[PDB]
């Protein structure tokens, strides 16, 4: 349930790549190949899945989203049955790369949240801007909009949300298009506020949502705005005043404090956001209220020790030694992760791997 009131109007990071399967690879058994690109900016990226030096035809990808630091992440995936002679990889091109990078498939009780992410990217002399919006409950996405898609409607992405009727879907579509109209204006406004020509591409990112505790009582609320991956204006933790990033944003901070915009947002974040998060948790409780404990395992002058965690939900986890690769989506709703540490051969028993996850009775300690 997005903001019902039309919103008030107004750095380059390279991607990290991971190529893996959904399930452990078994020759002759259907599986899924994944290429997870994360932590990059801007959003233009070319991703290919390769089979024996050839492009895989039917490849699908997830809807664009971004993290706290504003960097984007995506999951490219396709179905395949690995056999003996086949070799797979993923190729990624991005403005930060001299030439495309190839990565080969190396075969060998908690809080809750509702979040909405918005991304608008200008296309000089190529039509309207690209507008993408996705909704999340905890780590499960449940709605999406892509201005380039056919429907021009808010679309479901989880089973429980398909319950809702036409009144709900009509409203959400009316609201998302309003978010779109606002972003379209801001792009031109911010182009002027930064003295940029009408020839370059620019990005505006918006994120807002609310947190509740295990008692489903309001905990924290967010509302943030970013231009080209840099902070522009955000609502402070108390939801009563704004944080302006630079000199250009102070004009907007004063226009919004003059129009008391933070009061309407606080009411949404404290009330409506919470109320509909509660309804979602109940409607899809077979999904959103489950906890999948990680199936854990360990892999091994110097040698390498790697702790592995697979098929766990939610994504929040901690693997610590006594190299950490970003948590990645399995593609079926679960996640994976591993951590590594170097060790002189022989002294592999004086080290341990600790795993703090929300679904485990107590922490697990792993050693050779």
């Amino acid at each position, epitope marked *: 349930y997005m903001l019902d009131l039309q919103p008030e109007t107004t750095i380059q990071r390279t991607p990290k790549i991971q190529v893996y399967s959904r399930h452990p690879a078994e020759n002759g058994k259907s599986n899924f190949l994944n290429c997870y690109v994360s932590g990059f900016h801007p959003s233009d990226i070319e991703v290919d899945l390769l089979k024996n030096g*050839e492009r895989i035809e039917k490849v699908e990808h997830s809807d664009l989203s971004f993290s706290k630091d504003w960097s984007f992440y995506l999951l490219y995936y396709t179905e395949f049955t690995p056999t003996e002679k086949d070799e*797979y990889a993923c190729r990624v091109n991005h403005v930060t790369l001299s*030439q495309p990078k190839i990565v080969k498939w190396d075969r060998d009780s908690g809080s809750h949240s509702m979040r909405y992410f918005f991304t608008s990217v200008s296309r000089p002399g190529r039509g309207e801007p690209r507008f993408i919006a996705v909704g999340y409950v905890d780590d499960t996405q449940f709605v999406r909009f892509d201005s380039d898609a056919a429907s021009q409607r808010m679309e479901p992405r989880a089973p429980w949300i398909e319950q809702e009727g036409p009144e709900y879907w009509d409203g959400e579509t009316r609201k998302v298009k309003a978010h779109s109209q606002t972003h379209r204006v801001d792009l031109g406004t911010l182009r002027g506020a930064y003295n940029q020509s009408e020839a370059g591409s620019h990005t505006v990112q918006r994120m807002y949502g609310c947190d509740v505790g295990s008692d489903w009582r309001f905990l924290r609320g967010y509302h943030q705005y970013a231009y080209d991956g840099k902070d522009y204006i955000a609502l402070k933790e108390d939801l009563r005043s704004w944080t302006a990033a630079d000199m250009a944003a102070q004009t907007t901070k004063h226009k919004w404090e003059a129009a008391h915009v933070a009061e309407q947002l606080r009411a949404y974040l404290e009330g409506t956001c919470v109320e509909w998060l509660r309804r979602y948790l109940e409607n899809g409780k077979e999904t959103l209220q489950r906890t999948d404990a990680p199936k854990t395992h360990m892999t091994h002058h110097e040698a390498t020790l790697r702790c592995w965690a697979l098929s766990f939900y939610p994504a929040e986890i901690t693997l610590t030694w006594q190299e950490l690769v970003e948590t990645r989506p399995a593609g079926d709703g679960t996640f994976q992760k591993w951590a590594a540490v170097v060790v002189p051969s022989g002294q592999e028993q004086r080290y341990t791997c600790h795993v703090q996850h929300e679904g485990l009775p107590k922490p697990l300690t792993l050693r050779w």
Partner: nanobody
């Protein structure tokens, strides 16, 4: 391991055409996909066209309809027929090839200029 010999670049008037060709050395069973990326004014190089040994093609949006890639059935040689060239097609065009183990090989490149 593999050597990629390029030729066919140079200068052309706006609206003109050029034929690039790239020939792969080594074993004929050591190369599958071959094509061309091109240098951008910035740091990255963008896809222009490539083709699998079976003839599957993919083009970059900015050359769709104007550029055509083809391959010799016998030898590992590809051809890029560039038509209706514009100044914004000025760049160094790098031939490339993929081993059947997904190893990439890159040529020196050929400067293409449109007045």
């Amino acid at each position: 391991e593999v050597k990629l010999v390029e030729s066919g670049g140079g200068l052309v008037q706006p609206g003109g055409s050029l034929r690039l060709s790239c020939a792969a050395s080594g074993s004929i069973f050591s190369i599958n996909t071959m094509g061309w990326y091109r240098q951008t004014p910035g740091k990255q190089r963008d896809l222009v066209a490539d083709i699998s040994s079976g003839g599957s093609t993919k083009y970059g949006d900015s050359v769709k309809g104007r550029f055509t890639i083809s391959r010799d059935n016998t030898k590992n040689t590809v051809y890029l027929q560039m038509n209706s060239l514009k100044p914004e097609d000025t760049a160094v065009y790098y031939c490339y090839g993929l081993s059947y183990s997904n190893d990439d090989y890159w040529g020196q490149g050929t400067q293409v200029t449109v007045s």
